[PDB]
Amino acid sequence: GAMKKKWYIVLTMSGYEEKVKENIEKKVEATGIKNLVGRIVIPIRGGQRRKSEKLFPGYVFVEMIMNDEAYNFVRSVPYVMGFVSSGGQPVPVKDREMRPILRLAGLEEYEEKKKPVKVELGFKVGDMVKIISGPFEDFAGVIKEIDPERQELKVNVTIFGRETPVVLHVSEVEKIE
């Protein structure tokens, strides 16, 4: 419903995301349409300690009110290739799926981190590892690479129907078995 605002994924060209975000800010300024567009988020932003460098290339997260004037205004966005969707307009993202984007996007700050325990043994590449610490806490992933000497394990998380490797601390994830 237009009254309620949801978050959709805007399609773009890797490298033009920052431009798309700014284009939207002014696109609504010259049109004074600050009611169709709301807050824009980007999976690229990461913790200051480490930058994911664009978690999803060409993929951007934006919240806006659905409507005929909103679709025609967003679709007309410069540098925008369209929006991810099954039929027409794009579909809203499940809040549970944004949890990791809002937390990393700085949209939500929570604690839940009093379980500083390092996990080791039964750890191997390809093995299945579950996340339990960080912005993706509670996320299941597969061990893609193990970096010894530092206790770090690269895991591939399945987000947006796509697989993507994430850098985390071995003590921040669990290898189930």
UniProtKB/Swiss-Prot annotation:
GO BP term (any one): DNA-templated transcription termination
Keyword terms, alphabetized: Transcription, Transcription antitermination, Transcription regulation, Transcription termination
UniProt keyword Ribosomal protein present: no
Any one of the GO CC terms: cytosol
This protein's domain notes: The N-terminal domain interacts with RNAP and the C-terminal domain binds either to Rho or to RpsJ (NusE). Contains an additional, species-specific domain inserted into the N-terminal domain. The N-terminal and C-terminal domains can interact and form a closed conformation.
Its biological purpose: Participates in transcription elongation, termination and antitermination.
Family: Belongs to the NusG family.
Identification of the protein by name: Transcription termination/antitermination protein NusG
Parent-record interval covered: 1 to 300 of 353
